Amino acid sequence: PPGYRYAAAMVPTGSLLSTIEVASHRRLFDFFSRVRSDANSLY
Amino acid sequence: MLADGFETDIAIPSGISRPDAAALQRCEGRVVFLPTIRRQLTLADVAHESFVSGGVSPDTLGLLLAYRRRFPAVITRVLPTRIVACPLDVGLTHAGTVNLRNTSPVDLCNGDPISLVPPVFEGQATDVRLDSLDLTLRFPVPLPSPLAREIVARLVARGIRDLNDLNVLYYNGSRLSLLADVQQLGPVNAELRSLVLNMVYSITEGTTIILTLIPRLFALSAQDGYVNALLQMQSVTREAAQLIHPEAPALMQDGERRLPLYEALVAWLTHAGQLGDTLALAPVVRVCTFDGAAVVRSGDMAPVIRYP
Amino acid sequence: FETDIAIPSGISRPDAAALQRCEGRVVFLPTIRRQLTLADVAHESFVSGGVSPDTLGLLLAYRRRFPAVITRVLPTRIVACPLDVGLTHAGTVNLRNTSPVDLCNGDPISLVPPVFEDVRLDSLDLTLRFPVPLPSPLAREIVARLVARGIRDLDLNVLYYNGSRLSLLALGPVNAELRSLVLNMVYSITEGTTIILTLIPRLFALSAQDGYVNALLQMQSVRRLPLYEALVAWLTHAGQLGDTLALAPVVRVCTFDGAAVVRSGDMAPVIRYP
Amino acid sequence: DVEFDALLGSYCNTLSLVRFLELGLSVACVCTKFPELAYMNEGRVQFEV
């Protein structure tokens, strides 16, 4: 479970189209982080 | 045998972690049992979970008995996506040279035949486990040939004791023992029948003449020391000779035209001498080094050229 | 793939003609190697021990050594190819009989030490014993004859093959040369047929054509006597002889553009199992 | 006397050449190709909400 790279966000590839509750289904993803607002390990 | 070699491709699945992928790259030369000679199989076919019967994981003794129905192969190289082996029974490569790697507690010598044995030793049953796939890969242990006639003979003789010590060995002076464990009654009786068939079949009428030579040997071990250190301190025929005075039968039915000593020896070769192939498997492989040494060390590779 | 057995310096004139007469003959070496000395090749090379080895110890070394068939003989080096690695590339290598027995097409050929009756090089102080390439179905006969000869000591010498007659007797040394075989063949059988006789003590007592068959048909369906410690003294001993008296054939003759039956002194082309 | 046999012709197929993009299924793909993929282990994609 690697911590991914936050600067890939900083210029994104392609944007999503629909916001959902995301932590309802988790195991589609691997490194999942519920960030209550702007927090410690984002930096 | 084919001209361009014949290499099966045991497939590696998709999801494998880095603690597991570097655990298979240490499997460079091992012994891997294919059940058929399909060019494409899976690790779920190779591993011990395919080895089990209906739900009874067998002992070491049955693990002998289900090698002779499989085809032992040796890995030559490991890709990230598939494992390549070469079956011993079909054809080696272009070269006829496939590198092994000794798992043995005992080093080898040149020219000696290899019959493989399950991991019977203590502190030694080291199974390469895949965690992200939930498999155990039991790698058997290549040994020199006169060891494999001992260890198979130790285990079959042990199981007869349960049907009513022994587990100490010596080879090149290094003391080694074997694992004591309860043996299931099933496969041991498949050994006892495979004995007593090949044991009774070596008894021809001509053996009533050889059994009257026992008083000659027990007097021959008095004079020539070759026959003293032949019998043993722990043999049967010495205490057999001290109580029995045998004597030959009178005549034979039509015994003029036939040789009774000759028929007892032809039947002895193909039945009782052949016995080391019935219990264990066949010594397919010996070690034929090109430049290296008289001795191949533990944890080292060895070039290999085939053998009867 | 052709190795080299170099001849060391100082060869006399009859001896360059003596090695000119073993053109196509089977020789054992320790390890396949591109350069090798003749002193590691000769009969001296395994007289290790304090007695020169008899016919038993000859057999043991022949499974620990790798047989080679000599090609051309240059006066400086003996060029040879071994019968285990050099014959997948090059197809077929000639072979000369030293046998008293002729070869047919399609026979498999084992080797026997010279028990029947030997080039000596006195410039180099060694003998060169050579194996006898007889066909493998005779090998389980002839060795079984000669073992059966010594058992009489403590009719037999009749052999026919290919419409001919063989006389094994052709007496002094050969019976003494084959003492160690006779003293193991007897021991394995007498150890066998008393342990078998101890495990099931009735095997000589049942009525043969009436009740013993029921004792056979059941076997076919799917102080202290140190007995169970004495299986290992039998099984390892008997499991050792099953390789030595097997006499596995390296060699099968496939005749092509030649005579059907190759006689003594002639050459027969030879392939291994592919 | 006059007799004969005859071969009155022979008939073949054609293999239907199928582009994948001519199908109606080709929306459910994002097809960009790799000139190499065996030179790659686990690859990753990030989405953010």
TrEMBL record, chain A:
<protein>
    <submittedName>
        <fullName>Major capsid protein</fullName>
    </submittedName>
</protein>
UniProtKB/TrEMBL annotation, chain B:
<protein>
    <submittedName>
        <fullName>Capsid triplex subunit 2</fullName>
    </submittedName>
</protein>
<keyword id="KW-0167">Capsid protein</keyword>
<keyword id="KW-1048">Host nucleus</keyword>
<dbReference type="Pfam" id="PF01802">
    <property type="entry name" value="Herpes_V23"/>
</dbReference>
<keyword id="KW-0946">Virion</keyword>
<dbReference type="GO" id="GO:0019028">
    <property type="term" value="C:viral capsid"/>
</dbReference>
<dbReference type="InterPro" id="IPR002690">
    <property type="entry name" value="Herpes_capsid_2"/>
</dbReference>
<dbReference type="GO" id="GO:0005198">
    <property type="term" value="F:structural molecule activity"/>
</dbReference>
Automatic annotation (TrEMBL), chain C:
<keyword id="KW-1048">Host nucleus</keyword>
<keyword id="KW-0167">Capsid protein</keyword>
<dbReference type="GO" id="GO:0019028">
    <property type="term" value="C:viral capsid"/>
</dbReference>
<keyword id="KW-0946">Virion</keyword>
<dbReference type="InterPro" id="IPR002690">
    <property type="entry name" value="Herpes_capsid_2"/>
</dbReference>
<dbReference type="Pfam" id="PF01802">
    <property type="entry name" value="Herpes_V23"/>
</dbReference>
<protein>
    <submittedName>
        <fullName>Capsid triplex subunit 2</fullName>
    </submittedName>
</protein>
<dbReference type="GO" id="GO:0005198">
    <property type="term" value="F:structural molecule activity"/>
</dbReference>
